[PDB]
Amino acid sequence: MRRYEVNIVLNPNLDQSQLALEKEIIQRALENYGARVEKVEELGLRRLAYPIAKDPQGYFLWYQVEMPEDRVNDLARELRIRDNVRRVMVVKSQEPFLANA
Amino acid sequence: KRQVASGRAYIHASYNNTIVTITDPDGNPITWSSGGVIGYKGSRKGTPYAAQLAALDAAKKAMAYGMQSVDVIVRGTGAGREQAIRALQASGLQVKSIVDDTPVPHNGCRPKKKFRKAS
Amino acid sequence: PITKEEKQKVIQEFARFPGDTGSTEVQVALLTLRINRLSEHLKVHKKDHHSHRGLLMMVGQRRRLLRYLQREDPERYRALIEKLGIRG
Amino acid sequence: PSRKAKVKATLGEFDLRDYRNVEVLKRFLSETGKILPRRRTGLSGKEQRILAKTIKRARILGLLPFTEKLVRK
Amino acid sequence: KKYRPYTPSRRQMTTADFSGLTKKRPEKALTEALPKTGGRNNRGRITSRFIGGGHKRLYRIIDFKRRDKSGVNAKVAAIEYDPNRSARIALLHYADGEKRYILAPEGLTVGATVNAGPEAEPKLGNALPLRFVPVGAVVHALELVPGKGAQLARSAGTSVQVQGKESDYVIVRLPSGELRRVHSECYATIGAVGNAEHKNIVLGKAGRSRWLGRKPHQRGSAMNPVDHPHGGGEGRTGAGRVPVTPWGKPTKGLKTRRKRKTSDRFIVTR
RNA sequence: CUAGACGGUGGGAGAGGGUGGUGGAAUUCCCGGAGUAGCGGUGAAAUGCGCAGAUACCGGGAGGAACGCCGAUGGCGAAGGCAGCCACCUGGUCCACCCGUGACGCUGAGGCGCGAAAGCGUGGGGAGCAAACCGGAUUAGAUACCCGGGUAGUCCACGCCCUAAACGAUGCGCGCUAGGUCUCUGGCGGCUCAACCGCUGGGGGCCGAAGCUAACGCGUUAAGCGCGCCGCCUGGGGAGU
């Protein structure tokens, strides 16, 4: 396992209740997932660009962790499969690049 | 049944021919007009004269339900929008934007036999 | 990480004098030893020609040190042959 | 010959990766969707090689469409 | 010289041409029972269909999937080919009351888990409501019956992609009938086929199956002046787009209207 | 003994490759919608679709295949060949800090690999277009060039040939001989100039004394000076018989 970086998005139409439940399912993946956890910040809410899902609006979040390579091909699918999550991007972070800084 | 007066028009353009669209503030069209209506397509159409007599027919079934203010945008590359220009304020209408764009596949498909290489 | 991390064990175990940085014990071994995760590039990536020939430069060394260990000191010869066999 | 306004990398509080406080991805970016070649890119090209995907994420991520609008093409 | 595995496709030997059969199997003793059953070939004071109809009947037995569940924990281990068609048929397990043949994705050695429970396991599973289709891989257990659920019994295809989610609630494609969005509200077992192509895989010659299960046919044109026109020339056929008793050899369409296929359009085949 | 070859650290570069979800301007169309008389396409026209609602216009939909902008003297790349997000795996490549093994190597009809588009087969597949075939139409004549359709095909797996204005038409490798014009790229950092600068290396278009051809011209990536070895040519045709 190594340092990563994932971002998940889904159905914001539901109130904060049924909109932040999947987070729970991620918590179980933070401690009960072989290693442990890392850091976490939240974009909060930044409008996309063009309309999708028949709506130019939405709600957002973001994360960053470390997890077992094996459970990866199921960790993100775990929620991406349903009509909820529809876009995910896991990225082994470690030493990217900076705009001269 | 609208009588909104302040409407738009999904103007367009193409090589062989050209067809202007006149819709409402959100999309639903109305009818259609052109210059190549009467005998003017084979070799005749080779000139903007088609785009010329395009408003001299639309006004018939358009400037009837109270419409003297239309949005204006350029779409597609036509054989001669030049004449179509005469259909400007010269027909008692109105203008809006100077926008002039036209879609094109960034190689998204297979055009004709030739379409690449430089020099 | 791919540098000499794995090679660390090949220092107090499969090597010559304290600090063997380039003996047979730590030479062609790394090649075959790499095969473990090398053939792993065969699940898919079977078209990754930009790496398949990257091994063509070891086709020789793999069986280059021959007329030097069998034709003299059998030690550096059958040093670990009975651990990889010959001609598959 | 001739160019436009002086564009490059004055400030530096930003970053060609951080999204929480995006800036240059908007300001110094083209007023169109066209991936900055080298001229109008402002910077140059090296900070654009990978930059392309750094911002392209926005596309698939809905954060950005395809391109913008202009005039006279 | 391609698929998995052993096809007796003898490239011209001795009265045994390019065959094509079986695979692996743990080989089971023999089936414990086979409820109801009965037979085959003919029926209703008459006969019907003069194509195929050998000796060996039955063996197939029912395969009621999941009518209940609520909590089971199974395991899976053995397996056994059996129904009329070469298609294997799984072997299930549990320990509660009945067995019910169950389906079979791809083959397994000695392990698995199984749960058959709404939200259970990524791997092999069974019973669960229907909206559960993020990707929708190999099925091999589709079915149309509310309380019940079974359908297919063949090692051919068994893999359908699930559509979106709009009005009239319609989704899922089907084996070979292009574009026919079906209404849906049931289940299956979601799993592969095991030896896909293996379902119509060629045989050597003739005389060791067509009698031995089915029957000898490759005919046409009775040449029977009475109700069979085809037959009465120097050796040609001339005109007559007739099949038999003027049944229209060509398409001529057929069933339509119907319950369903009243909102299940697009069924055309190439 | 280390100049060569070889592996270590620390970083970086891209259209290198196999697999999996797909991002959207796409364009043929299925359907409803507004709902008129032509659309289309040539330098002049037409098979077609027209009075069944064609042309076009809003949406819901089926899909297959392609990947504009960046793109330019560009990069990857033995080479063929390759310019969408991310990931499992992986090839070749870069300097400084030398860590050491210590001649451990460059080539080589024969083979193994690659195997430009297309072409073979089994199953799949089908929007766009396309060999055969087929229309209006050139003209005397027109199985050309225009337009209009469409089958294998352009498409995934796997097994074939081994080919082309495949070209730096110049086989790999080493050392060497004025430089400059400019470009993608790594590194050490000069009164720490806060928009800089030198020095050093890999790839890449151009100019010239000189050497070289019979030239054009090669021109720092050498055809200038040699070498470690395989290749071919030896008057043309007929001849890849």
Within chain A, where are the H helices?
16-19, 22-27, 69-75, 77-80
- Touching chains E and D? (3+ Cβ pairs < 8 A): no
**What 3-state DSSP class applies to A18?**
helix
* CATH number for the domain that contains residue D31: 4.10.640.10
Nearest-5° angle of CA E81, CA E82, CA E84? Answer: 130
Residue ranges covered by each domain of chain B: 1-119
Question: What's the Cα-to-Cα distance from A45 to each of C52, C56, D54, rounded to whole Å?
Answer: 46, 52, 19
Token output for B100:
């002039």
Neighbours of E139 (CB within 10 A): 28
Find and list the nucleotides of strand F having atoms within 7 Å of a protein beta carbon.
6-14, 16-19, 21-27, 30, 33-46, 55-58, 60-63, 65-73, 76-81, 84-92, 99-101, 104-106, 114, 125-129, 158-159, 184-186, 195-196
State how many domains chain D has. 1
HSE, CB side, 13 Å, CA atoms: give it for residue A14. 12
**What 3-state DSSP class applies to C51?**
helix
What class is the B1-119 domain?
alpha beta
Cα D24 from Cα D46, distance rounded (Å): 15
* CATH number for the domain that contains residue A9: 3.30.70.60
Q: Tell me if E7 sits within 8 A of E20, measured CB to CB.
A: yes
Q: Tell me if A86 sits within 8 A of A51, measured CB to CB.
A: no
Enumerate the β-bridge partners of residue A4.
Answer: none
What class is the C1-88 domain?
mainly alpha
DSSP string, B56-111: HHHGGGTTTSS--EE---EES--TTHHHHHTTSGGGS-------EE----SS-S--
Spacing of D45 CA from F207 C1' in Å:
29
Give the residue carrying structure tokens 């408003």. Answer: B55
Cα E99 from Cα E65, distance rounded (Å): 10
Q: Residue B38, CA: closest nucleotide via C1'?
A: F38
3-state secondary structure A63-91: CCCECCHHHHHHHCHHHHCCCCCCEECCC
Cα E263 from Cα D39, distance rounded (Å): 57
Cα C36 from Cα C46, distance rounded (Å): 16
Query: Hey, CA dihedral for D29, D30, D35, D38, is it positive or negative?
Result: negative
Token output for B75:
């779409």
Cα C76 from Cα C70, distance rounded (Å): 8
Give the residue carrying structure tokens 């926008």. Answer: B99
State how many domains chain A has. 1
In 3D space, the residue among E66, E172, E160, E184 whose CA is nearest the CA of residue E120 turns out to be: E66
Question: What's the Cα-to-Cα distance from B102 to each of B11, B77, B107, D69, D71, rounded to whole Å?
Answer: 11, 7, 15, 11, 11
Q: Tell me if D40 sits within 8 A of D4, measured CB to CB.
A: yes
Within chain E, where are the H helices?
none
Cα A52 from Cα A86, distance rounded (Å): 11
Task: Determine phi and psi for A88, rounding to 5 degrees.
Answer: -145, 150
Question: What range does the domain containing D36 cover?
Answer: 1-73
3-state secondary structure E179-201: CCCEECCCCCCCCCCCCCCCCCC
Cα C24 from Cα C65, distance rounded (Å): 9
Question: What range does the domain containing A91 cover?
Answer: 1-97
Q: What is the dihedral of CA E267, E192, E71, E30, to 10 degrees?
A: 110
